[PDB]
With several copies, the nearest count.
Chain A
Amino acid sequence: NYGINLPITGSMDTAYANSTQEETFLTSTLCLYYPTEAATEINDNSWKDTLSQLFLTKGWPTGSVYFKEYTDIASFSVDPQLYCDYNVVLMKYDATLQLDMSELADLILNEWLCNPMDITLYYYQQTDEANKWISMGSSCTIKVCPLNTQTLGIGCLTTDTATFEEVATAEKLVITDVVDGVNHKLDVTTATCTIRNCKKLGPRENVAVIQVGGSDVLDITADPTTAPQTERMMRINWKKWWQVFYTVVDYVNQIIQAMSKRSRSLNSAAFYY
């Protein structure tokens, strides 16, 4: 870049450089994320291969596509380092894991900026509807204690964590939200967890969480007031896994077109500061 300042021209030359799918077929990569159960049901040693030849049909050169195996929504949630240009992740609603799923969607579907937090030495504060605490790891257990303007507890003793308020009991991915503009002494189990202070924003012009199962709704809003429904949030009717993949292939471009590359220069988008 170096350039944003100094506006573009709005003249309606009206020409539209035809296509766009013919540049993405040549230059981009497609990464498919699925759960173990998905592949196990397929039971072939060459399914990744067969689908790949089928992918040439839709226009993706041999070395282009891929296949990454998450075995659970919890593991996939923490060490997600989206590998390719375009990532389409397959999630088959599991009804008890809904929020696990919501927290994972909220992370992939969106653009995140994070800094590290030292729960040990400092007493901090969430700023706007976009400042959230995203923690993830083996077993994430977060207890909180709100401070009045004196560094004193409110319903707690900053001295004994037995008076803290538990807001997460051993999760694999957690986006914690506290009353904005209030300091809190935090007590995470840093041994198995890592908690970082993130500011939200830009969405993701990649993922395309495709949901298998139920009667699926997701609520990225930590609030109650809003409900956002984006194009990068699709849903498929479950029959068999082979069918799911056939559809994903038969409609790759349609799915890719709902995302759009150009937004992917980081390994993992846990933006570090």
Chain B
Amino acid sequence: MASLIYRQLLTNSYTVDLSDEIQEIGSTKTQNVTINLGPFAQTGYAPV
């Protein structure tokens, strides 16, 4: 009894994915927020 129910689950987990994968194509939009982004140096105005 429980034997099934329990095991039955871990048996049908492979599904988790497929489904999981649905709601994405379906949820909102994804966004690539990694635009690299470079750091410092300091150079300036030179005239009298």
Contacts and interface: CB of A to CB of B under 8 A. Distances in A.
A–B contact with Cβ pairs below 8 Å: the answer is yes
Interface of A: 44-46, 157, 163
A46 B37 CA distance: 10
B19 interface: no
Name A's interface SS: loop
A46 B40 CA distance: 11
A44 B39 contact: yes
5 contacts: A44-B39, A45-B38, A45-B40, A46-B39, A157-B36
A45 B36 CA distance: 12
Contacts of A157: 36
B41 to A, nearest CB: 10
Interface of B: 36, 38-40
A154 to B, nearest CB: 12
Contacts of B39: 44-46
Nearest to A46: B39
Contacts of A45: 38-40
A238 B12 CA distance: 56
Contacts of B36: 157
A159 B38 CA distance: 14
Nearest to A162: B38
Contacts of A44: 39
Nearest to A160: B38
A46 B38 CA distance: 9
A60 to B, nearest CB: 22
A157 B37 CA distance: 10
B5 to A, nearest CB: 28
Nearest to A47: B39
Give the 7 A-B CB pairs with smallest separation, nearest first.
Answer: A45-B39, A45-B40, A46-B39, A157-B36, A44-B39, A163-B38, A45-B38
B37 to A, nearest CB: 9
A243 to B, nearest CB: 21
A157 B38 CA distance: 10
A44 B39 CA distance: 7
B40 to A, nearest CB: 6
Nearest to A44: B39
Contacts of A46: 39
Nearest to A163: B38
